[PDB]
Automatic annotation (TrEMBL), chains A, B:
Molecular functions (GO terms): methyltransferase activity
Keyword hit for Transferase: yes
Pfam family, one: Methyltransf_25
Protein name: Class I SAM-dependent methyltransferase
Compositional bias per record (Low complexity), positions renumbered to this chain: 1-12
Domain of life: Bacteria
GO BP terms in the entry: methylation
InterPro entries attached to this UniProt entry: Methyltransf_25, SAM-dependent_MTases_sf
Keyword Transferase tagged: yes
Length: 258, 258
């Protein structure tokens, strides 16, 4: 049989909860915001490890997938960049002269985006109505980009997030949310059996970031199909208005119900 | 106070001991052996996480630090590439027409180097005398490159490794071993206190690789100064013949004693 590895860490010498994504983005920006400077490390709750280059968070508009390019060029009115990261999307809108605000729960991400020139509210999405300063919003356009629909989480979390966005939305507001329409890879079969034992929806993973001795919170993450997204929206304040594909990716337009 | 994060994994859904480095190198080679394809993730025994791009293991000679370039161009006779990885150094020697053998304990690394065209013995360094096939060696030149001296480990491990290399060495053989002469960064103070409590030498870390659900063995790793290396060699079959610096890096030439 296969031998489990056993965890790192001991009392006084172990990873601590904090803001590893902010640290990665800060290191990336400090080197010029290009590739081969800093790396995001994601750990799943079974310990599955995968990394990627953090330069993606600083990529200019011409390098974005078409679904993100479409969303940014259509943005109008008061824009909220939901989960802005290093601000690549909202920064493009600010350069174009629009009224843009980012929101992100990572203090370090917020600091990086602000340094690049984007106003950022530090808040969890579900804290938006409580944290939004008077005079900001209501918003005409919400950006949920960078597999943004995957950040919606489980149906319960998605409904609370969408409810929070509607609370700060202007009449007729839209969410421009992109996603991936891909089947679950076959090697995920064992992880999916674990999901079923725990009552968790098919296709979700529970993941966290790690960097140096810092660890982020567990959060739920998925690739949500356009049909899955339609089901999530039933009963919410939001109508699925259209779905636009670019190969594997899609851009969904959600409209606020009157 | 700061809150410890708590480990990932549960019975039946947790990381397993295996060959994560081989998996990373295989993914890198399968994409063309360039950057932005696959990433090495290193975890220290306190849980400290750092990643880097695995493309470095496929870099051509013109991209190597000068200390590695010097070593490879001086290699003569029967060469052993000690800890060959994806084989970048031995491959250059094989292309130049030399008799070269790699040795690596990662089966996947060995497979990658072999596919690129380098003969590789799968063995731990300390297993070289037992595993070396008759007719291979004795070796005139040993390459210990890519902060190779850092792989020597603690003094006890270093002495056993050097003893194993001498066992398969030709008369007058040399080890060409590179290293880093840098002070310990100040943020390592807490980790160094942990070393002292455990009787472990100043400047060492205990680290392992992680990739997907695989975890490598714990191994000891250090940046060994030229003076540290001289102390390690006292009593061994090896004399420190010369030290050549290129900025922060050095190339040490060790000569087999008669
Ligand atoms: N529940 C939540 N509330 C607020 N921010 C969140 C969040 N979940 C994730 N985030 C933030 O959303 C970002 C996701 S990374 C994507 C960033 C950006 N949309 C881009 O495409 O470049 C991270 O910066 C993370 O801190
Ligand atoms: N004790 C040991 N015995 C055999 N191989 C070892 C070893 N410790 C580390 N290695 C191998 O040595 C390699 C270190 S990475 C460096 C590879 C190569 N020298 C280069 O510079 O590109 C890894 O492939 C690892 O599997």
């Amino acid at each position: 049989g296969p031998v489990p590895a056993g965890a790192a860490g001991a009392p006084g010498h172990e990873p601590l909860l904090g803001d590893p994504f902010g640290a990665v983005l800060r290191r990336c920006l400090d080197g010029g915001g290009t590739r081969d400077l800093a790396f995001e490390v994601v750990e799943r709750d079974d310990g599955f490890i995968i990394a990627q280059d953090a330069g993606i968070y600083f990529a200019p508009p011409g390098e974005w997938p078409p679904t993100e390019q479409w969303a940014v060029e259509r943005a109008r009115g008061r824009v909220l960049d939901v989960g802005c990261g290093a601000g690549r999307h909202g920064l493009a809108l600010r350069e174009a002269g629009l009224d843009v605000l980012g929101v992100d729960s990572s203090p370090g991400a917020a600091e990086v985006a602000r340094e690049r020139g984007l106003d950022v509210l530090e808040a969890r999405f579900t804290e938006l109505p409580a944290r939004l300063p008077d005079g900001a919003g209501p918003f005409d356009t919400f950006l949920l980009l960078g597999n943004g629909t995957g950040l919606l989480g489980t149906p319960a979390q998605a409904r609370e997030t969408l409810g929070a966005l509607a609370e700060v939305a202007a009449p007729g507001a839209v969410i421009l949310g992109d996603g991936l329409d891909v089947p679950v890879p076959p090697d995920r079969a064992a992880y999916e059996r674990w999901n079923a034992e725990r009552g968790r929806p098919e296709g979700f993973v529970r993941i966290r970031l790690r960097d140096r001795l810092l660890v982020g919170e567990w959060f739920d993450y998925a690739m949500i199909s356009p049909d899955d997204l339609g089901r999530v929206l039933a009963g919410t304040r939001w109508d699925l208005a259209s779905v636009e594909r670019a190969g594997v990716r899609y851009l969904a337009t959600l409209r606020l119900r009157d």
